Amino acid sequence: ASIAQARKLVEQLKMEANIDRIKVSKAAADLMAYCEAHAKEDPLLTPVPASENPFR
Amino acid sequence: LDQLRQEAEQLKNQIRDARKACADATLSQITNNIDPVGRIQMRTRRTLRGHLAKIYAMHWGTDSRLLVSASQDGKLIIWDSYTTNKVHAIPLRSSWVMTCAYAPSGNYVACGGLDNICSIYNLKTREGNVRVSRELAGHTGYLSCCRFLDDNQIVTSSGDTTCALWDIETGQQTTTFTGHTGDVMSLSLAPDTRLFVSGACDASAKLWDVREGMCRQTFTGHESDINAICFFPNGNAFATGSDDATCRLFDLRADQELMTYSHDNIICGITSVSFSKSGRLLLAGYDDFNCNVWDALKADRAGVLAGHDNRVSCLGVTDDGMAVATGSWDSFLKIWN
Amino acid sequence: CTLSAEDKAAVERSKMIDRNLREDGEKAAREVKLLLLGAGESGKSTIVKQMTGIVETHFTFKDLHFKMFDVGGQRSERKKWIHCFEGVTAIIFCVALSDYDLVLMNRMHESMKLFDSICNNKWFTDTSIILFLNKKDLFEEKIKKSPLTICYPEYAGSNTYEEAAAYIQCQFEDLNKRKDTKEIYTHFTCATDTKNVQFVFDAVTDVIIKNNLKDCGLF
Amino acid sequence: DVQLVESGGGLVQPGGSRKLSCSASGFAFSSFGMHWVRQAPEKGLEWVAYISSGSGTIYYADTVKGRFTISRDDPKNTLFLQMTSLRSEDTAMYYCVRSIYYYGSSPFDFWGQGTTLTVSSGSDIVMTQATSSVPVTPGESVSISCRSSKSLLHSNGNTYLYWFLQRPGQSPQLLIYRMSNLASGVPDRFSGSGSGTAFTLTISRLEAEDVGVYYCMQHLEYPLTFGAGTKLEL
Amino acid sequence: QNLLITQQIIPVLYCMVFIAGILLNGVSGWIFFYVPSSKSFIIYLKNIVIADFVMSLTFPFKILGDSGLGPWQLNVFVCRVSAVLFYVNMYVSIVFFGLISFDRYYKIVKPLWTSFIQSVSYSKLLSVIVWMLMLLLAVPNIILTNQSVREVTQIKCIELKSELGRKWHKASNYIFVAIFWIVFLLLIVFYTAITKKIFKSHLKSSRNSTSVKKKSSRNIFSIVFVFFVCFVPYHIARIPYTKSQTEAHYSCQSKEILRYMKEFTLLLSAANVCLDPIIYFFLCQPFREILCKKL
Ligand SMILES: O=c1ccn([C@@H]2O[C@H](COP(=O)(O)OP(=O)(O)O[C@H]3O[C@H](CO)[C@@H](O)[C@H](O)[C@H]3O)[C@@H](O)[C@H]2O)c(=O)[nH]1
């Protein structure tokens, strides 16, 4: 029981070990670019006038 | 036994070393050159009343107008948020529901809780009454979260430290996701509905593949039970809210925590986490009866939503990002714009 | 007036749903919510017999409808769903007296730890906890052969059923850190006793009177 | 499954009284509004009355207000229409029409069989049909045009236009609700379009199963008015 | 007596009552604006705080008139409008205290009748019809004076009311006294029954039972004692004063002593305005929860 669980955990860790990791400077830049690109289409970030606001 | 434990420790050390090696910079010092979002002033536009007990979950419709919510009184109420009209009121067999989902097509709704059973109700019945369509059973723990993945199958997470993708037509567990050592408390499906992150009480989240059924990634760094989880709109990142007063933004590609959102004035837990349409704002419901909107790129608290007199149990954002619906334990829902 | 025929009819449907929900809430308000708790097979099934994850038992006694919710077999983190029972009118905590001399750490020690955790947590800071001491006949039978000193080394009394039962009840009640606001009702039962429902009725009647006083701005 | 069986028709002398009944089965009659609609042997443009769920609101046509009364009994799931001092203009077939009202609902979706009742010898918005008889051939596309006195588009963005099809010997069935939405069970061959005043129903790949009279109805105002009825031949 | 009670002590005590009650009821109304209308008790408390705030707004006119420093043509407005409004608010407060007592009696004692008066669903209608009844009852007291002053330096209110006005003033005051007395009797019997039920509730348990009984009995006794000491003297002295201002069978000394007694008893009834928040609103759980969350 314990041996099987330990083997399964080791296999899971090994499977998670060999993955392609990009630099944080790349992922953060991509997230920032996505936020900037969609900034003009965010009603919460930029409030929408009551003419086009369906909750007024 | 001992050799396997040593190998697992070595693998964990290798994972940590790789994460440190790929962490050449940090999101906070990268987004220092962008202007802050300022002060977010969201005023409650709609106030939905009619729940007789604490509201435990809500889910927006894909049309950004319908809103399903579940209460401990045994009621699942579907609101027309534009006119504050009760489109539907479904009495539930078990009143201990703590989760609810809205199908992307809108033809079905889901609920679940301490009964360890996921009830799917059909909204488009020819008889005109909302009758339960399916009764998924097989979870040995409380249903903490459930998210629809098209009409035919649904992803749920239970208190027995497992998640399950069920085929609704057959009612059988198509896939079982196991490996969490604590009770899974939240779910979040990716926009393409191919991967999903689930946070558990083991102070850890896991990125799982729906088709493969294997744990794609594991994310750690929270100090207590994770109660909320939500993908970034891009789908390459997600945010977790935990019992300790801090949210954490992790990135799937980097397999690391990008940002931490915490304040010294907050010492309460986090019950709900959601993003805006662009992902710039992270909205988190807290146990201090108030919601906090943080600048996700700068970790600065953009604003506060202080309209709830009790714990904000559930929070959601419309698909078009027009408004945010927060349901609390005061038996009220508030839609802010 | 700003509303179409379909919009007005939908508003009427919403009003009808509001009326139905108000009626349902009024009906559920007078129901007595009970939370059944215990360390295991201490007698929760025995209590339910004479009165999935959650088991709901609804029964009417002396014009009061009791809904008792049993959380046995949940086997998950208890702290993650106790807040759901914050509004529960009363908590029936069942303890096996004969489990005083048994072990899994003593079984009665685990029962006392669970009682301390349930009674002294934030969600039940004022919820009344009626306590049942089941298997009193078995406890009396095995108290002459198995002294209470095994479970309670500080017990200076004799091997008498009355003294041992009183000491155990006092030890269970001493775990309450909010005796000013919370009342613990202690009852002794053996098997298929008809006085259990009467004792629960009296306890919940007192709790309901106190809650009515609180809700009227009078307590 | 869903069924609305009507009874109580027949021959009535002028000035008499008759109580038409509609028994409902297969659906929650309590939560559904019920309309009484009149199909004359020639026109079929008349809507008699309407009762809401729970009898909260009751509406009558100008011709029948003060003369007819509509009631419902939810426990027995029945709809009653009591008519006193009947006139010769009331000789027609009466239908009880199921109609639920919420966001995204499909009112007027199901119609009853109808009963024939034969009597012996201005501000309402009007809907007009552009044609009466249209010679058509199966496999082609047919457009039915209708016009309205007032714009059917509301301030909430909803255009309350309904397209029904009545087959020879069959009760009318809902094809299009709110001018753009396909009713359940209706094949995708039917499409609806409009600009608030003029509307068009387009049928692609016509077959023999959709040959009949096409009616347009407005639900913007409480007095519900129907179109003249565009009939398709061959 | 003269120029020292009416003009020196009465205005000072009334302005103390005002500076207390105006602030207390303003804060109470600000808190109650956020209190949900979850039960009949909440709406009765809101009506009571509204009446108390209007009484507090009325108080400065009285204190400015009695002091004798304001314009000689302001006492006419004080008696014609402000005094009648103050009496309306006082009597709606009294009948709402009676309604609260009845609601508590029904909720605690749990009687057997088919349905309770002041039922929560219709409690809003009950409150509005009570307001309308009192307003219509005292409206002629405002719209039936219509008489000249004829003495600018000395204004007597009963002297500037018509014969029909005087008759209606007498009858209206008599029936306000009667409605107060029947409401007081109903309140007394309801609270006595509530106390009897409470003392028969907890019979076996201790420690917590004693605390619950003590708190409930103290609250009930405080309510009834404050109601008594604030209203009973006024309504045992009002009828002799009412027939003193309307009949000539009274001597000047008797008229003056009755006026002083009425003024002091009405001062007690006005101090009830500032006493009300600490006896009724503070015990309300939602009100206390919302108030305590400010700081
Ligand atoms: O129960 C009542 C009794 C009287 N009134 C009316 O309100 C006014 C108040 O007069 P009254 O109650 O007779 O008191 P008075 O002793 O006449 O009071 C007048 O004279 C007092 C000094 O003696 C002043 O303090 C008051 O402001 C002034 O109104 C009168 O016009 C009445 O018509 C009511 O509305 N309800």
Short mmCIF file of C-alpha atoms in Angstrom, two decimals, chain B residues 54 56 72 75 77 85-89 96 98 114-116 140 142 159 183 185 201 225 227 243 311 329, chain C residues 7 10-11 13-14 17-18 21 24-25 33 52-54 69 74 76-77 79-81 83-86 123:
data_model
loop_
_atom_site.label_atom_id
_atom_site.label_comp_id
_atom_site.label_asym_id
_atom_site.label_seq_id
_atom_site.Cartn_x
_atom_site.Cartn_y
_atom_site.Cartn_z
CA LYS B 54 -26.73 32.30 3.31
CA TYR B 56 -23.05 29.85 -1.02
CA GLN B 72 -28.59 26.94 2.26
CA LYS B 75 -33.30 27.11 -3.14
CA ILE B 77 -32.75 30.96 -7.88
CA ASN B 85 -36.57 39.39 -11.98
CA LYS B 86 -36.61 35.82 -10.69
CA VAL B 87 -36.62 33.79 -13.90
CA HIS B 88 -36.64 30.49 -12.01
CA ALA B 89 -36.80 29.08 -8.48
CA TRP B 96 -26.81 21.84 2.06
CA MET B 98 -22.37 24.89 -1.45
CA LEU B 114 -23.01 17.87 1.65
CA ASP B 115 -25.21 15.25 -0.06
CA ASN B 116 -22.15 14.18 -2.14
CA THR B 140 -17.51 10.25 -1.14
CA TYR B 142 -18.99 17.09 -0.14
CA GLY B 159 -14.34 16.85 -0.31
CA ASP B 183 -10.20 18.47 0.16
CA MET B 185 -12.50 23.48 -2.53
CA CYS B 201 -6.93 22.06 1.45
CA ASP B 225 -6.42 25.89 2.62
CA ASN B 227 -10.86 28.06 -1.14
CA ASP B 243 -7.42 30.89 4.15
CA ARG B 311 -19.06 37.09 4.61
CA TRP B 329 -24.00 35.21 3.74
CA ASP C 7 -41.91 42.34 -19.22
CA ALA C 10 -42.36 38.34 -16.18
CA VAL C 11 -42.52 40.80 -13.27
CA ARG C 13 -44.09 35.73 -12.38
CA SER C 14 -41.22 37.07 -10.27
CA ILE C 17 -42.02 33.33 -7.06
CA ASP C 18 -41.37 35.87 -4.30
CA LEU C 21 -40.34 31.72 -1.47
CA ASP C 24 -41.44 28.44 2.10
CA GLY C 25 -39.20 30.53 4.36
CA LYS C 33 -32.96 22.41 13.09
CA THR C 52 -25.14 9.76 1.64
CA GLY C 53 -22.82 12.23 3.35
CA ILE C 54 -25.67 14.05 5.11
CA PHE C 69 -29.03 16.31 10.11
CA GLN C 74 -18.43 12.60 5.84
CA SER C 76 -13.56 15.10 5.20
CA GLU C 77 -12.32 18.31 6.82
CA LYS C 79 -13.94 22.83 9.56
CA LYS C 80 -14.92 23.29 5.89
CA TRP C 81 -18.66 22.69 6.39
CA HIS C 83 -20.30 26.97 9.10
CA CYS C 84 -23.22 25.57 7.09
CA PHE C 85 -24.83 24.56 10.40
CA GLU C 86 -24.41 27.97 12.06
CA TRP C 123 -19.92 29.03 14.60
#
